[PDB]
Specification:
part of a larger assembly; 4 chains; A mainly alpha (96); C alpha+beta (1371); D mainly alpha (259); A: mainly alpha; globular; D: 11 helices; 65% helix; binds guanosine-5'-triphosphate; binds ligand 2TM; binds magnesium ion; binds zinc ion; DNA-binding; DNA-directed RNA polymerase subunit beta (chain A); sigma factor (chain D)
DNA sequence: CCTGCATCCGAGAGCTGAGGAACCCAACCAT
DNA sequence: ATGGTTGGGTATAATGGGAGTCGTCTCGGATGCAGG
């Protein structure tokens, strides 16, 4: 909304258009550096005002919200690497 | 049904006060409404405007009262007609519901007149919404105005 | 940090759930009402979930960093980042187990399938309506022993567990007819109105009076209800002993002397079924003890039990009574279900089901297969079935269910907090009741309420009435409602987001812009490019630091004028993305170079408005800024508007002249025609010139001189070059439309100066006169189609850069010429032909005749109605023809006629409505009014005619409103079914192909007729030739991409009879896994060149199919005098039609046998014969004594695709589906290549069903992917095993999409609960192959620049490469 | 479904009591408690432990301290010569009577609790808290006074229901006394409005409450009594806008502040 | 015993923008 | 050491609820019942 100084919605169909163009890096920028990659958006702003190029993006916060909400339904969702070993996306902040 | 009044200009408020809604508490659902409720029924003639309606997903579910129409004590819309007796148009005006209106032959308001007498051999009329051509002797009522 | 390659979902054990949590939530308190701080052990506790502030405990002993991993002793709060409050979970320990509703209410139930219980039985046991038997312990019910897994009602369990007893009242003044302790048989009357019903002993209950003798004479004592009788019936008493004990000592009854005791007038009598054993000393067993036969009760073993029962010791009568009852262990609820699930052995069940698979019945085989599916999923995943029952409930971290304080000082909170509070309250109350020894009814009720509370927390409103907050009707939002739906997490926050660096504004036409430019408002651009601007102001001297620049830009009146030049410096060479919703295809987002403008509107180029579907009556567009160098490169190379000139759907130009451009070009290229001369004959040109000078012959009249046709202008004005002709035009000598003679390119052309000017415009735009002369059509007026052909040819011959230059030149000159041409609309421009009047009068006569034929009986109602309708239809067609003929002959330059002929605006139907008449109108029921609207819009309708047309107007509006939603749904389904298809390799090496036919059978079944040119173009253009072709002395080699000239050559050869079909590579036969190959796909239609490897062709196919449907397939419907979108949806969903035709199952010859009552068709071949009985009213496409192949239709109507697959085969059904889908789009004038439909159909034909497992671990009737069964068969053949036998399937787009291997895409699509339940049971792992999964994880999609084919490319200059080479040589 | 009718059916599946049966059961319970304390004195163990083991043996194997220790103590109770197994017998009979009395009087709980609907607790929660109060009343009843059981039990059932309502009706817990203060304030304001013909002011409410009450205290008390609103409250006619979509996050630093 | 055919239940139904009811007494931990 | 908060008790007799919802159209599977 304009009254909340908000942004525009990049909905499903806009994502489809970006995919049809083959613009992979543009779409990943819309999904992470400009919406909810907190570390990514902070680093991108700092790099732009410092004169450098924006860094690589990370996991969006919405995927972490999804994982936590799936755990609340007693479902174990795990991200694995190429050897089927677990990879921690929470930076060790959620393991005892 | 209690809505923030639209008052961009005087006509906006006058339009808002004459709105008729099929939705609301105890009404139809926009996503569930089909095609039968949104149609212009033949009995809308003189009671609900066939033109003025929203363009989007509310088309046919919100309408407007016609200019000469009146809602009675029982909640039924009535429209006025002049009584025609023996091919002579009188000034007696009767407000009818659609049920009463279905019983008569009603001539168009542009029927030519010489004084107050139907001066035309062939008269365009409605019989239960059907357009018919009749003689002036068969006319029972006449429209008040377009 | 290792990269994420897979995502696994599985069931969580109670141990896993408890290891997740940081503590148990024990209280339903959220925050302290006074200090607003989290309460201890509540739902927001910092001791469990984490600190509110960064590196600071609650009490404040520690308030700094490097205390990480330090838990404060005083408060117990770990000192760390507060962000951990959105990651750390809690848990609730249930007093009694509860079931996860997802594995109960997801039809068919997983728990029910594993335990072989129906839905009704599961509901009865789980919600405490029936018991289930575990360890029957040899109990007997109705004479039948009870067995395990048997369901007992309340009464049945009560009689088996506690016994039988009935108490009968005795009215005052009526005494019993039996003594105390006497046995009773059913029917033995105990009162003049009381008859017993059950056998067993009868005991007294509160005898009202007592008779005691005195050693004898009798005496009576009345006993009031507040006192009790201690002495037993029929026993002696002594002097001083008390008989009837009372509360008050003075109210006690003490016999004065010796005597016997008898009890009379009982209050009630209790008949039980029990054994009686009298004793004389201490007993062994007390009340409430259950015993077996031959057990010790009293007297040191002298008395022994004969039956099972429960012991009750009566001290008044000094007797032990064994009530006949058993110790059956029957339970209710999730505890019973979990006990049954824990005992289940999966391997023995698997063996039993494998044996069951051999039963001859197919229903039993299906039941066993369905059970084995679940059993094998559990065996493979490693999950335990008992984990479907919850013991510890996880608690979501508090920052995902926030309790926030709004700006007004109030609080807002999620519904999950209320659901958790209800669960905790009910759990705590159950624990309190259990520790207090409550009766069984109260505990049953509390356990039922706890089960319902867990159900509401997990899935609200799935069973029973949904939970609502008090005073309000709105249901609470549970975790399932958070996850699924259009408003759910998947569709609202993962597949689409709101973004930074974006704006939006109203759009305005930009006629002075270039094709690659947009006008961007200055304030918009200052806000969009703010960090770049701050850095640029830093680089200059506008601000000393970035913070000062930000403060300057904060206030509008503080902004200087050098910042605008800095902003111009910032955006130099960059592009922005413009997007207009809805984004139906990929050209709804385009990249433009911004030009900073004054004002608040975005300026848009005229030529992109058709791609965007934008006009200028208030539309708005969104602006996005790609940030990095990669994003800017992608936007500038792939998305720039000037690089996207052809349509990806059809290969036709999409940026092309329209509206005023067409109007101006048509106006200047149309020649004049005059009638003053009118074909006079002359001998010598001097005579023709003399006659023109006299005024007898007009300049452009078609005269004949010396026996040849010419005009005066052709002889009078001969020009040496185009410059002289245009100089003559500038002097008023001739007009642009007069036909003269010009010498051009060494040839004496007879043409108008306007056409020469158009040729010069093209030649100067493309900077090449010879190629420009080859491109244009000189001798026709330039209209929509010729200009589109010119643009396509220019693209093919010159490239996108020169084509864009030509487009801008054409736009400029068309606008200029339409401004000065004099195009306008007046009321007199809607010319009414005179013939119309005649056509009406004639109609008025014929109508009369019809009425006569109806009055005299020769016509019925229906036939007369049909005759009237046909008459008015033919009259309307005649009036349309007369209107257009009048325009053609008398007013060739009329504005309406020019607009409709040039293609700028309008169609013949609208012009007829303006000039001739509106025609027949339809009633709301869908039938036509008898009387038509005989007026046009120029004359003016009457009130009745207007009201008649309103029905059609409203029907069209409502049709548009419904068709939009239906088409959007179809597009989403297609995207979900095709999103993983990418061009992944150059060539799959297959030798299969498809044959495109150049002929089709006739409608009247006459013979083979050549197909339309458009159809063949849509089926052949851009494809790779599968085999060598030789036509018209030209050899087209194998592997050749078919260009449009080759397609025209093939059509020309077909017209000469040399060829009947073309073999081409197609996606239907490609062997690439997870996509297609370059050769099997063909051209990139938007570039007229072979497709690049890494292109996401599935998304393009889905958008190409879905975009036309949104409006075109049955835009504003004009109410003037099975099919459409539903047919396409039916074809894509593989539905069986309601009017399904009849197709011959096998080959044979046809014999039609029709009787007075029945009709049948026999197909008789040399081996067998079949009979088809169809209703007599049906229509046959077959004649008697005809030959029909297998799958050949015998009836008019739609063919069942599954029947066709069973009869003819998979290629037949694929061809049928492609052709039938293309029919609908051709009906609406939509051009769309067959590649896209073939992509979708190839996805639809992806699965096979196992008919014979062979030597594999598959089951009969199991459905799997064709690639998997092919690989398994190849391995078996290599190893020497029996092959798996299978049959192809056909499923719709919805079912095919939901059956994908990736659970993330299927979960985000539809039916989320079912997908997640199945994936969790099976322990499914997602390999992230498609696009939706990678988008959800925020990863680089494996298409385009993210493809593995291109994304590892390096770039380096010569010097660096030489240096590296020398470094290698040195070592 | 409809668990209310299910519970009502289970409740009505137990017959009511007459005065004789009720007084008999109450006397049996009292003698059972006396026998329990006598047995505790004889064996020297705690009354609570012996009551728990006797209740475990009465309720049987169906109701799931462990079988080892309960069987040990139950055998130790069987070791008594005479006149003490009698006390054990009366203890068991009294516990059975307690169970029967509670089951028979469960209907009065529903009759009482049906008048407290619409105050933030559902009907079945009210019924369960009333059942807890009923169990308390059975524990504390005395039949010597010749009072009907309902007379004494109604007070305890009402106490349990009201304490439950004051403890579990609000998302933010408020202490019991201040809940009573809020209810008193609401009643006072309502009567003031009824007498005044318009909504009272804070000064008038303060005057009506009495000493130690002024406008500021009334304002604070009305301030704390506000209930939280839902982040999922719909906004607008369409089901596409919620309340929480308009509430920004103020905790996490913005990109500007981080830079 | 098999089979098909009414019957019932649950999950779908375009995008974007804007929009707002008792009281009392007594003891016990917190600060 | 003071309010703030929590627990226990009140004794004639009382003993099975209440708001509600009826203007969607389809489709695919699960299921029980009819026939042979
Ligand atoms: N994406 C999208 N565009 C729309 C929609 N409705 C209208 N538009 C676009 O906005 C343009 C102007 O809309 P109008 O119908 O003139 O007016 P409006 O802004 O929608 O507002 P009102 O008529 O005042 O209700 C249209 O010509 C369309 O391009 C819609 O529902 N979605
Ligand atoms: N609900 C809606 C309403 C509109 N739209 C979009 O806005 C446009 C408005 O056309 P329009 O209705 O302005 C065209 P009209 O003036 O009749 O056309 P003509 O000049 O070509 O004859 C549609 O074509 C859709 O792209 C939408 O996506 N959802
Ligand atoms: Mg609008
Ligand atoms: Mg338009
Ligand atoms: Mg528009
Ligand atoms: Mg000359
Ligand atoms: Zn601390
Ligand atoms: Zn291939």
């Amino acid at each position: 909304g304009k009254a909340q100084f908000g942004g525009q919605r990049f909905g499903e169909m806009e994502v489809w258009a970006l995919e049809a163009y083959g613009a992979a890096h543009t779409l990943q920028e819309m999904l992470t550096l400009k919406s909810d990659d907190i570390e990514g958006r902070n680093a991108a702003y700092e790099a732009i005002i410092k004169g450098e190029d924006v860094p690589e993006p990370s996991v969006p916060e919405s995927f972490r919200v999804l994982v936590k909400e799936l755990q609340a339904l007693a479902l174990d969702v795990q991200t694995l690497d190429e050897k089927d070993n677990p990879v921690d996306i929470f930076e060790g902040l959620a393991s005892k | 049904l209690s809505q923030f009044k639209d008052e961009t200009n005087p006509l906006s408020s006058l339009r808002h006060k004459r709105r008729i809604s099929a939705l609301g508490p105890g009404g139809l659902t926009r996503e569930r409404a089909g095609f039968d409720v949104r149609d212009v029924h033949r009995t809308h003639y003189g009671r609900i405007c066939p033109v003025e309606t929203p363009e989007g997903a509310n088309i046919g579910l919100i309408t407007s009262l016609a200019a000469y129409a009146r809602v009675d004590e029982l909640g039924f819309i009535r429209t006025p007609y002049r009584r025609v007796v023996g091919g002579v148009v009188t000034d007696e005006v009767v407000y009818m519901t659609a049920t009463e209106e279905d019983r008569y032959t009603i001539a168009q308001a542009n029927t030519p007149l010489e004084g107050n007498r139907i001066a035309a051999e062939r008269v365009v009329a409605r019989r239960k919404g059907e357009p018919v051509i009749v003689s002036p002797e068969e006319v029972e009522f006449m429209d008040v105005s377009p | 940090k290792k990269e994420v390659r897979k995502v696994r979902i599985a069931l969580a054990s109670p141990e896993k759930i408890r290891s997740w949590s940081y503590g148990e939530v024990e209280k339903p308190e959220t925050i302290n009402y006074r200090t607003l701080k989290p309460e201890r052990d509540g739902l927001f506790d910092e001791r469990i979930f984490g600190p509110i502030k960064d590196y600071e405990c609650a009490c404040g002993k520690y308030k700094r960093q490097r205390f990480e991993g330090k838990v404060c002793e005083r408060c117990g709060v770990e000192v760390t980042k507060s962000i951990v409050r959105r990651y750390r979970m809690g848990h609730i320990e249930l007093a009694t187990p509860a079931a996860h509703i997802w594995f109960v209410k997801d039809v068919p139930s997983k728990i029910g399938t594993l335990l072989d219980l129906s839905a009704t039985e599961l509901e009865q046991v789980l919600y405490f309506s029936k018991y289930i038997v575990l360890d029957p312990k040899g109990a007997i019910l109705n004479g039948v022993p009870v067995e395990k897994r048997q369901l007992l009602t309340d009464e049945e369990y009560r009689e088996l567990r506690y016994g039988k007893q009935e108490t009968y009242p005795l009215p005052p003044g009526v005494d019993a007819l039996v003594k105390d302790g006497e046995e009773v048989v059913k029917g033995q009357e105990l009162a003049p109105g009381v008859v017993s019903r059950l056998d067993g002993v009868a005991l007294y209950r509160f005898p009202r009076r007592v008779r005691v003798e005195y050693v004898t004479e009798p005496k009576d004592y009345r006993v009031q209800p507040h006192m009790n009788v201690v002495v037993p019936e029929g026993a002696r008493v002594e002097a001083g002993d008390k008989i009837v004990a009372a509360i008050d000592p003075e109210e006690e009854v003490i016999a004065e002397a010796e005597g016997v005791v008898h009890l009379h007038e009982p209050a009630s009598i209790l008949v039980v079924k029990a054994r009686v054993y009298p004793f004389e000393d201490d007993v062994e067993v007390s009340t409430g003890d259950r015993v077996a036969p031959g057990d010790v009760l009293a007297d040191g073993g002298k008395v022994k039990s004969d039956v099972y029962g429960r012991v009750e010791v009566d001290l008044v009568r000094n007797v032990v009574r064994v009530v006949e009852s058993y110790d059956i262990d029957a339970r209710m609820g999730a505890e019973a279900i979990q006990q049954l699930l824990k005992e289940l052995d999966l391997e023995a069940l698997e063996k039993e089901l494998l044996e069951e698979m051999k039963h001859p019945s197919r229903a039993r085989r299906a039941k066993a297969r369905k059970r084995l599916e679940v059993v094998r999923a559990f065996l493979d995943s490693g999950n335990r079935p008992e984990w479907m029952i919850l013991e510890a409930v996880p608690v979501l971290p508090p920052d995902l269910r926030p309790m926030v304080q709004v700006d007004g000082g109030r609080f807002a909170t999620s519904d999950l907090n209320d659901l958790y509070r209800r669960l905790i309250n009910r759990n705590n109350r159950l624990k309190k009741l259990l520790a207090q020894g409550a009766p069984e009814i109260i505990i049953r009720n509390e356990k039922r309420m706890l089960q319902e509370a867990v159900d509401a927390l997990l899935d609200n409103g799935r069973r029973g009435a949904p939970v609502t907050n008090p005073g309000s009707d709105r249901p609470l939002r549970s975790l399932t409602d958070i996850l699924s739906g259009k408003q759910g997490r998947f569709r609202q926050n993962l597949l689409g987001k709101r973004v930074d660096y974006s704006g939006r504004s109203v759009i305005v036409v930009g006629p002075q812009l270039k094709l690659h430019q947009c006008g961007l408002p200055k304030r918009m651009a200052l806000e969009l490019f703010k960090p770049f601007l701050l850095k640029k102001m830093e680089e200059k001297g506008i601000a000393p630091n970035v913070k000062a620049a930000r403060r300057m830009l904060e206030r509008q009146r503080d902004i200087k004028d050098e910042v605008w030049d800095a902003l111009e410096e910032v955006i130099h060479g960059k592009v922005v993305l413009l997007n207009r919703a809805p984004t139906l295809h990929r050209l709804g987002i385009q990249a433009f170079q911004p030009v900073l403008v004054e004002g608040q509107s975005i300026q848009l180029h005229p030529l992109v408005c058709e791609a965007f579907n934008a006009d200028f009556d208030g539309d708005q567009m969104a602006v996005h800024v790609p940030l990095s160098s990669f994003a800017q490169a992608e936007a500038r190379i792939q998305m720039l508007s000037a690089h996207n000139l052809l349509s990806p759907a059809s290969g036709e130009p999409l940026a092309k002249p329209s509206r005023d451009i067409i109007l101006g070009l048509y106006y200047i290229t149309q020649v004049r025609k005059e009638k003053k001369g009118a074909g006079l004959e002359f001998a010598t040109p001097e005579e023709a010139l003399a006659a023109h000078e006299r005024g007898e012959v007009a300049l452009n009249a078609p005269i004949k001189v010396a026996g040849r046709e010419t005009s005066v202008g052709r002889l009078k004005y001969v020009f040496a070059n185009p410059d002289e002709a245009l100089l003559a035009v500038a002097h008023g000598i001739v007009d642009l439309q007069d036909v003269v003679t010009v010498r051009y390119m060494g040839k004496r052309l007879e043409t108008s100066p306007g056409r020469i000017l158009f040729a010069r415009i093209v030649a100067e735009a493309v900077e090449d006169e010879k190629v420009a002369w080859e491109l244009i059509q000189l001798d026709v007026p330039q209209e929509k189609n010729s200009l589109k052909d010119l643009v396509y040819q220019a693209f093919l011959r010159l490239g996108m850069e020169k084509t864009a230059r030509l487009l801008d030149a054409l736009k400029y000159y068309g606008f200029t010429f339409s401004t000065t041409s004099g195009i306008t609309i007046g009321i007199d421009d809607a010319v009414i032909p005179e013939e119309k009047k005649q056509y009406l009068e004639e109609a008025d006569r014929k109508l009369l005749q019809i009425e006569q034929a109806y009055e005299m009986g020769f016509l019925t109602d229906r036939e007369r109605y049909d005759q009237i309708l046909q008459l008015w239809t033919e009259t309307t067609e005649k009036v349309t023809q007369a209107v257009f003929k009048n325009f053609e002959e008398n007013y060739p330059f009329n504005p309406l006629y020019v607009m409709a002929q040039s293609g700028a605006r309008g169609n013949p139907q609208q012009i007829r409505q303006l000039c001739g008449l509106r025609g027949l109108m339809q009633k709301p029921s869908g039938e036509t009014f008898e009387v038509p609207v005989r007026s046009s819009f120029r004359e003016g309708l009457t009130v009745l005619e207007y009201f008649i047309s309103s029905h059609g107007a409203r029907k069209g509006g409502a049709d548009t409103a419904l068709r939009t939603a239906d088409s959007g749904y179809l597009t989403r389904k297609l995207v979900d079914v095709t999103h993983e298809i990418v061009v992944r390799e150059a060539d799959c090496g297959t030798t299969n192909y498809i044959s495109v036919p150049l002929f089709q059978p006739d409608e009247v079944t006459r013979s083979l007729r050549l197909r339309k040119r458009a159809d063949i173009e849509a089926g052949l253009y851009g494809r790779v030739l599968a085999r060598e072709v030789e036509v018209l002395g030209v050899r087209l080699e194998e592997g050749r991409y078919l260009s449009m000239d080759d397609v025209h050559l093939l059509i020309k050869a077909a017209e000469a009879g040399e060829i009947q079909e073309v073999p081409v590579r197609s996606p239907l036969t490609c062997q690439t896994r997870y996509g297609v190959c370059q050769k099997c796909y063909g051209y990139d239609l938007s570039m007229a060149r072979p497709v690049s490897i890494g292109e996401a062709v599935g998304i393009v196919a889905a958008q190409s199919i879905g975009e036309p449907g949104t409006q075109l397939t049955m835009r504003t419907f004009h109410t003037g005098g099975t099919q459409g979108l539903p047919r396409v949806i039916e074809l894509f969903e593989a539905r069986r039609p309601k009017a399904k035709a009849v197709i011959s199952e096998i080959d044979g010859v046809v014999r039609i046998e029709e009787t007075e009552e029945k009709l049948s068709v026999f197909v008789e071949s040399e081996g067998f014969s079949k009979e088809y009985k169809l209703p007599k009213e049906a229509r046959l496409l077959v004649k008697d004594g005809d030959y029909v192949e297998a799958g050949q239709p015998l009836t008019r109507g739609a063919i069942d695709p599954h029947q066709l697959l069973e009869a003819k085969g998979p290629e037949a059904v694929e061809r049928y589906l492609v052709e039938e889908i293309q029919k609908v789009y051709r009906a609406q004038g939509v051009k769309l290549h067959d590649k896209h439909i073939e992509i979708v159909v190839r996805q639809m034909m992806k699965y096979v069903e196992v008919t014979d497992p062979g030597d594999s671990r598959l089951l009969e009737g199991q459905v799997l992917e064709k690639w998997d069964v092919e690989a398994l068969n190849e391995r078996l053949i290599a190893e020497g095993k029996t092959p798996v036998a299978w049959k192809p399937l056909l499923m719709g787009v919805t079912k095919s999409a939901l059956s994908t291997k990736s659970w993330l895409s299927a979960a985000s699509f539809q039916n989320t609960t079912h997908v997640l339940t199945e994936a969790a049971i099976a322990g499914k792992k997602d390999e992230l192959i498609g696009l939706k999964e990678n988008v959800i994880l925020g990863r680089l999609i494996p298409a385009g620049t993210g493809s593995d084919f291109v994304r590892f490319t390096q770039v380096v200059d010569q010097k660096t490469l030489k240096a590296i080479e020398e470094a290698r040589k040195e070592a | 479904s409809d668990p209310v009718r299910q519970y009502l059916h289970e409740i009505g599946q137990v017959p009511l009591l007459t005065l004789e049966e009720e007084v008999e059961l109450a006397r049996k319970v009292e003698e059972g408690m006396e026998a329990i304390k006598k047995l505790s004195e004889i064996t020297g163990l705690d009354p609570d432990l012996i009551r728990e083991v006797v209740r475990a043996k009465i309720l049987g194997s169906a109701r799931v301290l462990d079988p080892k220790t309960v069987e040990e103590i139950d055998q130790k109770l069987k070791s008594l010569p005479k006149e003490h197994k009698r006390y054990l017998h009366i203890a068991r009979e009294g516990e059975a009577a307690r169970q029967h009395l509670i089951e028979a009087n469960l209907r009065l709980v529903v009759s009482i609790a049906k008048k407290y609907t619409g105050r933030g607790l559902s009907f079945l929660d009210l019924i369960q808290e009333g059942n807890q109060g009923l169990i308390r009343a059975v524990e504390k009843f005395e039949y010597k006074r010749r009072f009907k059981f309902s007379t004494y039990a109604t007070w305890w059932i009402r106490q349990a229901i009201n304490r439950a309502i004051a403890d579990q009706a609000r998302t933010i817990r408020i202490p019991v006394h201040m809940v009573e203060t809020i209810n008193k304030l609401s009643r006072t304001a309502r009567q003031l409005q009824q007498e005044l013909g318009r909504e009272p002011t804070y000064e008038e409410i303060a005057e009506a409450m009495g000493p130690g009450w002024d406008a500021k205290r009334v304002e604070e008390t009305l301030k704390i009594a506000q209930e939280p609103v839902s982040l999922e409250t719909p906004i607008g006619d369409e089901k596409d806008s919620f309340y929480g979509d308009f509430i920004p996050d103020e905790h996490l630093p913005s990109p500007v502040d981080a830079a």
